[PDB]
Structures are given as structure tokens and as C-alpha cells.
Design goal:
Lysozyme C; Glyco_hydro_22_lys; Lysozyme; identical protein binding; binds krypton; globular; binds chloride ion; binds sodium ion; bacteriolytic enzyme
């Protein structure tokens, strides 16, 4: 599923990401924009042989099982394919675990490089939330 901007904002809010670990909703929308262009089916993969999945490009090195990432973990307790669903629940629940892991949203390199410190509220401007 390719979400619209406000559509994704609303879905993220319903799933409890607004202000989760202190990160306002625009942070999450901005991260999703640059990770996946709002496409749940995005994959990419990594040099190391891991793969990133879904709207927030969550990595199989630590977070999900894909059967083809040697030595990896599955800390979210999910198949990586669950991260590609039109239903964002698995991506949200796993993102909550990632952002709680000590480096906050810096876990997403694209958030650090493209969203952090910017006017992220612009990503939710106009939306009915
Ligand atoms: Cl957009
Ligand atoms: Cl915001
Ligand atoms: Cl594996
Ligand atoms: Cl393969
Ligand atoms: Cl594990
Ligand atoms: Cl699995
Ligand atoms: Cl959803
Ligand atoms: Cl933080
Ligand atoms: Kr909502
Ligand atoms: Kr929800
Ligand atoms: Kr996919
Ligand atoms: Kr891929
Ligand atoms: Kr998400
Ligand atoms: Na894994």
C-alpha cells in the first residue's frame, strides 16, 4: 500500500506514535517519507546481506526474521514480511521497540540526515488528526 501523507499521519496517530518517546508525529511521517516514500512494500538489500522492510525500512539484522540473514536476531518476534502489510501495526509495534533502544530516532539514518532538526511539523500540516 502507498499511503497518502495525511492518511499515514492519521494511521500512525491511531497506533500511538504521536509523541512516542517524545517524537512528534511529523518526525515519524518525515522518516517514512525518506525511508520508503510511504510504500509499505518497500525493500532494500544492505551491503552486509541484511534487508530493510516496509514503511520504516526496519532491518533483518536485528528486528525481524527473513531466513536469509546469518547471525541475525528477530527482536520484534515477526517475519519480515509482516512489515510489508497494508496494515501498519507490525511496523509500528516494532518501531516502538527500536526507538526505545537507546539512540532514539537516530536508529533511522535517514531521519538523522533528512529530518532531525528540520521543521517536521510541516509533514502533518493541514491533516485532519
Ligand atoms: Cl509527500
Ligand atoms: Cl510534528
Ligand atoms: Cl536469518
Ligand atoms: Cl534470497
Ligand atoms: Cl532473537
Ligand atoms: Cl518468521
Ligand atoms: Cl493501518
Ligand atoms: Cl531520544
Ligand atoms: Kr487518530
Ligand atoms: Kr491501533
Ligand atoms: Kr513486497
Ligand atoms: Kr530487496
Ligand atoms: Kr509505521
Ligand atoms: Na533477523
Amino acid at each position: 500500500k502507498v499511503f497518502g501523507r495525511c492518511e499515514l499521519a492519521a494511521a500512525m496517530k491511531r497506533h500511538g506514535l504521536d509523541n512516542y518517546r517524545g517524537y512528534s508525529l511529523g518526525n515519524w511521517v518525515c522518516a517514512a517519507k525518506f525511508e520508503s516514500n510511504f510504500n509499505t512494500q518497500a525493500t532494500n538489500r544492505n551491503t552486509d546481506g541484511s534487508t530493510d522492510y516496509g514503511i520504516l525500512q526496519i532491518n533483518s539484522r536485528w528486528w525481524c526474521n527473513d531466513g536469509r540473514t546469518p547471525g541475525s536476531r528477530n527482536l520484534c518476534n515477526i517475519p519480515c514480511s509482516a512489515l510489508l502489510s497494508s496494515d501498519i501495526t507490525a511496523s509500528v509495534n516494532c518501531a516502538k521497540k527500536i526507538v526505545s533502544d537507546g539512540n532514539g530516532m537516530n536508529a533511522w539514518v535517514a531521519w538523522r540526515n533528512r529530518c532531525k532538526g528540520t521543521d517536521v511539523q510541516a509533514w502533518i500540516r493541514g491533516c485532519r488528526l
